[PDB]
Each structure stands twice: as C-alpha cells, then as structure tokens.
Amino acid sequence: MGQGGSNPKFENIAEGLRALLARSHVERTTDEGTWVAGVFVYGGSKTSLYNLRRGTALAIPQCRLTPLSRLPFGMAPGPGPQPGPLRESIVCYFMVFLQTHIFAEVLKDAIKDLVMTKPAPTCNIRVTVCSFDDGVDLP
Amino acid sequence: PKFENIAEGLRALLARSHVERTTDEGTWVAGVFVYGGSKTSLYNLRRGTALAIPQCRLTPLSRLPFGMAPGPGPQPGPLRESIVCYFMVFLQTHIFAEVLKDAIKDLVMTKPAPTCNIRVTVCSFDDGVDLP
C-alpha cells in the first residue's frame, strides 16, 4: 500500500496481470529462446499505454518490450507533405516480444480482461497477437 | 537520391511477381518487420518502400529491446533498449508481404555495410490492426 493508501497505477496493472496470468499455466520460454510471437497493444492514450507497458514489464520477466511509437493512418491518410504511407497518426502502440505462441494468446486475453475493468481511455486499448515467420533477433 | 534510387530497385524486384496487394475488406493483417542496419540506412529504405508501394502503411523508426544474455546472471529487463532500430510495413495480404520480404533481402544483399546488415521477417496479426 503506498503513502496515503495507494500505489502507482502501473504497479496495479502489474499485480492485475499476475493474477489473470496465475489462472493459466502455459509455457513462457523455449530451449530455442527465439522470439517468435508478440502482442501489439495500441490505442488508449500515451499515458494509458506508458502505464500498461510499465506494468507488463514488472509482471512478466520473460518478455521484451519496445518503446512507444506512433501508428500510421489507414484508409485515406489526410493531406500531407509526406507521402501517404509515411503519414503518422497520434495513436501509439507498443509490442511485446515473446517466445511461445500460447503465452502470447494468454497475454493478449489478460490485457483484454484487465483494461475492460478500467475507465476510458484505458478501456479503449486494443490488442492483437502476432507471430514472426522467421523470428526476430533482438540484440 | 537514394529514396527514388532505392524505390526503383524495389520496384524492379517487386515487378517480377504479380500478387494481390489489396483486399476488398481493406484489413491490415500482415506486415514485414525490418530491423538492423543503422538509423540512417533503415530510414532510407523506409522512404524508398513508401515511394515504391502506395498500398502500404509504415511505422516511424523505433528501438528494439535486448534478447537473451548468454550464460548466467545479467539478464536485461523487459524495458531496456538497444541502439538497433526497426519499422514495420502494414499490408493487406500475406503473399505480398512474402514478396516484399524477398525483395528487401535481395536489394540490401547487393549493398555495402551497413545496408547489407538489415534483416527482415514477415509477420501476421491475427485480429488485424485497426489503423486510424
């Protein structure tokens, strides 16, 4: 409990994940140790996502997290100096690198469940699994 | 200007296969994850991939985390970042992601370091990525 009865918001995400994840005991790492799956977390707001990320990190020793970056526009990128492909929105994302595909499915389902418990914009954070066809070699 | 010079290179290697670049759903379900090289060569390729492929969307460059420390003790931490950059190219089909991964490997292959050091993998998002 912190000074005056409360904990930093990411400390509460870390614990909430620890609980959801205590429910499923799938494997987290391989012998190969290769980074083949991930979760792409996007939307919310930069502070909702700085907070989710800082918590994923304390809750899961076994993942590696990117910084937050901005996302491009989809369907009809605005007016632009820059070519349409390169034009970036103010929606941020971050990625979690993982070594098994089921831990990625179980992580994505715990982020879904946790954020739905929180108020906007946090409840509006979206998440998707991804696999990397040749794996990523993180340095 | 390596932007159109790289674009012309992409363009001619891409030009060989003819596959679908687009779906009527419009969904962003595949990408090519490009990393390694230097900020500079990676920025240059990004600009070329943009000029060459109107049908794709690209992330800014960002920094990659550390992987696995060999042997014991010091194991890095989920949040520490390396000096190695990356970007992602979003695509509407998995096969054109196949073709652009191959086109990037072949182009940087014929190039001095650090451009020849850029690695490239294909990836998929199961529920798609709802770009803004």
Curated annotation (Swiss-Prot), chain B:
Q: What is the effect of changing T110P?
A: Decreased EBNA1-DNA binding, formation of functional chromatin, and origin recognition complex recruitment at oriP
**Quick one: effect of changing R16A?**
Impaired cooperative DNA binding
Residue(s) at site: Interaction dimer-dimer? R16
Q: Which residues of this protein are annotated with the site description Interaction dimer-dimer. Required for episome maintenance and generation of immortalized B cells in the host?
A: Y43
Lineage: superkingdom: Viruses
Binding residues annotated for DNA, in chain numbering = Y43
What happens when you mutate Y43F?
No effect on DNA-binding. Complete loss of DNA cross-linking and episome maintenance. Complete loss of endocucleoase nicks in the DNA
Known consequence of changing Y43E?
Answer: Complete loss of DNA-binding
Cite the residue spans of the region called DBD/DD. Answer: 1-132
List the subcellular locations.
Answer: Host nucleus
Q: What else is known?
A: EBNA1 is possibly linked to multiple sclerosis in the host. Antibodies that recognize both EBNA1 and the host protein HEPACAM/GlialCAM can be produced when B cells undergo somatic hypermutations. A mimicry has also been proposed between ANO2 (Anoctamin 2) and EBNA1.
User: What note about domains is in the entry?
Assistant: The N-terminus contains the region UR1 that binds zinc and is essential for EBNA1 to activate transcription. This domain dimerizes upon coordinating. The Gly-Gly-Ala repeat region (GAr) inhibits the mRNA translation of EBNA1 in cis and thus prevents MHC-I restricted presentation of EBNA1 epitopes to the host cytotoxic T cells. The chromosome-tethering regions contain Gly-Arg (GR) repeats that function as AT hooks and are involved in EBNA1 stable replication and partition of episomes. The C-terminus DNA binding and dimerization domain (DBD/DD) is required for the viral latent DNA replication.
Q: Which family does it belong to?
A: Belongs to the herpesviridae EBNA1 family.
Subunit notes for this chain? Homodimer. Dimers can assemble into higher-order oligomers like a homohexamer. Binding to the DS element involves 2 dimers of EBNA1. Interacts with human USP7; this interaction is independent and simultaneous to EBNA1 interaction with CSNK2B as well as necessary for PML nuclear bodies disruption by EBNA1. Interacts with host CSNK2B (via KSSR motif); the interaction requires phosphorylation of EBNA1, is independent and simultaneous to EBNA1 interaction with USP7 as well as necessary for PML nuclear bodies disruption by EBNA1. EBNA1, USP7 and CSNK2B form a ternary complex.
Q: What does this protein do?
A: Responsible for the origin of replication (oriP) dependent replication and maintenance of viral episomes during latent infection. EBNA1 dimer interacts with the DS (dyad symmetry) element within the origin of replication oriP and with a host mitotic chromosome to initiate viral DNA replication during latency. EBNA1 binding to DS recruits the host origin recognition complex (ORC). Governs the faithful mitotic segregation of the viral episomes by binding both the FR (family of repeats) element within oriP and the host mitotic chromosomes.
The protein here is known as: Epstein-Barr nuclear antigen 1
Question: Which species?
Answer: Epstein-Barr virus (strain B95-8)
Identify the segment of the full-length protein shown. 476 to 607 of 641
